[PDB]
Write a protein that binds this ligand. Structure first.
Ligand SMILES: O[C@]1(c2ccc(-c3ccccc3)cc2)CN2CCC1CC2
Ligand SMILES: [Mg+2]
Ligand SMILES: [Mg+2]
Ligand SMILES: [Mg+2]
Length: 284
């Protein structure tokens, strides 16, 4: 194990820990691709957690500065303020692949707003949040996941990320509330006559299930649309991206079976992950 090798192993560790599902799927990529994924993910995770876990804006700005250092001087040695193991690895990927740095900055901008949390008025704002937090990631990943870095490849990758995020939100309703966040739009909550506080207290009624299912359908519709254009990605990434999505779609069904609980985090078992991988490989 070289030094860089250890830097990537640490990134791999962060991904296994925080996103078992993405880990399960993207670890099947060729070595050079999965390492890139590990690093890009770890950066994104670090950005997220600096607000969501530490609520530490100063930390957040260290990371942006690190990435900025990288973008500017890809080939100079940086005393990263941030987490030097991750930034060393990102810097390494940057040397070999084209990194959409503005997409990282869009992420940082969006995660920043979570620190002074205000609710969205409309769905279009929630959708813009999904771009900012997940669509951006799809953009950063795009050069890794396909050989055609065109606007149409990007469009599918964006929608992939945003649908993943919407599903993340639909799993996290309870725990986001306990964190005093609601990501359902005010528009849609009123229209459906849902109050998350109230629903948190006395359980899940018919008006909540309708609203949740309204967003689910959108995520499921969007995933379908991505799955059609799966060809945009490389041969090797196609079945992986299909798996990663199938798993995350299965998260919706798990919420459903647990009757939409706002009081635990549902998950897909490794055992069902394996199942899905089988279901998928017959066709590849
Ligand atoms: O930033 C997230 C993310 C991670 C990965 C993808 C993805 C995007 C496109 C394709 C595959 C995966 C999207 C979002 C979302 N949010 C929680 C998870 C990490 C950290 C902040
Ligand atoms: Mg977040
Ligand atoms: Mg978070
Ligand atoms: Mg979440």
């Amino acid at each position: 194990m070289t030094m860089m090798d250890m830097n990537f192993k640490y990134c791999h560790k962060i991904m296994k820990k925080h996103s078992k599902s993405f880990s399960y799927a993207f670890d099947l990529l060729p070595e050079d691709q999965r390492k890139a994924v590990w690093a890009i993910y770890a950066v994104c995770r670090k950005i997220d957690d600096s607000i969501d876990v530490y609520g530490d804006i100063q930390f957040l700005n260290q990371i942006k500065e690190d990435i900025q250092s990288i973008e500017k001087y890809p080939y100079e040695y940086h005393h990263f303020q941030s987490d030097r193991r991750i930034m060393m690895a990102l810097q390494h990927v940057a040397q070999h692949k084209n990194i959409a740095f503005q997409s990282f900055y869009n992420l940082i901008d969006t995660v920043y707003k979570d620190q002074h949390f205000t609710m969205f008025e409309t769905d279009a704002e929630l959708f813009g949040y999904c771009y900012g937090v997940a669509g951006t990631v799809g953009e950063v990943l795009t050069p890794i996941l396909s050989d055609h870095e065109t606007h149409q490849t990007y469009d599918v990758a964006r929608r992939l990320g945003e649908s993943l995020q919407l599903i993340n939100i639909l799993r996290d309703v309870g725990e986001d509330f306990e964190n005093e966040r609601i990501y359902f739009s005010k528009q849609r909550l009123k229209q459906y006559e849902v109050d998350i506080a109230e629903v948190y207290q006395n359980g899940v009624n018919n008006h909540y299930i309708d609203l949740w299912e309204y967003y689910a359908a959108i995520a499921e519709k969007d995933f379908r649309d991505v799955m059609d254009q799966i060809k945009v990605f490389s041969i090797e990434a196609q079945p992986i991206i299909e798996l990663a999505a199938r798993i995350y779609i299965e998260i919706l069904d798990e919420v459903r079976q647990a009757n939409y609980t706002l009081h635990e985090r549902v998950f897909v078992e490794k055992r069902k992950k394996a199942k899905l991988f089988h279901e998928i490989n017959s066709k590849y």
